[PDB]
């Protein structure tokens, strides 16, 4: 296969350490409720428990719950892992 | 009951390992995954759309050497053959 060797870089590091955390539960519930209220008119009792669940979630604060360290291993091992020729 | 994606079916004649039952094995398997590669100039296949259509996207575009995974010369020959094909009626 085609290998791709980089040039000498200043610092191997992920550009942005997106953590990729899970979406909020309260937001999901709110979206579900919105979807339900699309159908079934304005406020029918099919979404009677969903609204209650949303209220329970968003009682203390609007959202329920409130970093990736990959730099350390890349930073550490860049100089080793290089195919940089000798001094 | 459970879906197919979260259970590695060990083949009949194969060896296995304790690790092989795990989630991590399945993830590893998921991570790690022809006549033109066989060694015959693709410019024989310009009257054979069926075979040339394998090296083409659903719309009709030719696939890149990164995708198709050919020798550069062999890729260019394939491309030529495809272009010849579409110049003709067939393909």
């Amino acid at each position: 296969p085609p290998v791709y060797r980089l040039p000498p870089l200043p610092r191997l590091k992920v550009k942005k350490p997106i953590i990729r955390q899970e979406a909020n539960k309260c937001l999901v519930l709110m979206s579900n409720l919105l979807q339900c209220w699309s159908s079934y008119g304005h406020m029918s009792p099919k979404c009677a428990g969903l609204v209650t669940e949303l209220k329970s979630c968003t009682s203390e604060s609007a959202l329920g719950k409130r970093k990736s360290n990959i730099n350390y291993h890349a930073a550490r091992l860049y100089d080793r892992i290089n195919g940089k020729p000798h001094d | 009951k459970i879906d197919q994606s979260l259970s590695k079916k060990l083949p009949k004649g194969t060896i296995y390992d304790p690790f092989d039952f795990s989630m991590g094995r399945i993830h590893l398997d998921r991570k790690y995954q022809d006549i033109m590669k066989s060694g015959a100039n693709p410019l024989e296949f310009y009257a054979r759309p069926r075979i040339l259509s394998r090296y083409v996207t659903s719309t009709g575009r030719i696939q890149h050497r990164d995708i198709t995974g050919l020798s550069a010369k062999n890729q260019r020959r394939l491309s030529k053959a495809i272009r010849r094909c579409q110049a003709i009626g067939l393909m």
Partner: protein
Amino acid sequence: TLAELLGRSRIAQVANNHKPLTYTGKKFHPTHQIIETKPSTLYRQEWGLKSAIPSKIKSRYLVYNDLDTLERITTFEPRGGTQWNRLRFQEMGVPIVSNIGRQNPFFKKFNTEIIGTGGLSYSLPGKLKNSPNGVIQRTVVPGRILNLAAIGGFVADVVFFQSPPSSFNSMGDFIRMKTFLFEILEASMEKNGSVSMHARLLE
């Protein structure tokens, strides 16, 4: 000369290969030479290779491809599972015989194909195995059903008198949890080097 000593020596003895350490395809036999240390030598990170091996490795066995690479790391994997499969097979004590009518290859330009078995079993088929309870006719081995059954480091074809619903249908795709007993009938070995066992489910 030095050259002669090098040719003799234990690194030259390990036959070189650049096969993948991670091979997700079908594994019918060992790919790489397993290499053990002693505990003492492990304690001071010495495996008899070019370099020291990381102190993170606490297992005594490993597999490798390159003594040293361009990345300044030996290409290895700390695992020697293949020895344990062989030892399990030996314990099971089901002698491999060629189902095709042929002479045993160990008795009597180059052929790269596998000479009989690959050396997982040098056992001969004619023996019985006595015990306090008596002469063992049926070899009892615990294994796991997948859907085929995993029986002591080998996957094996299975047969039974009646398909038991109580054990199977209660947990349809969690059959791997419950270990069942098996009666291994015989072990044949095909051209590709796969051990084709045949078991029978006991209840």
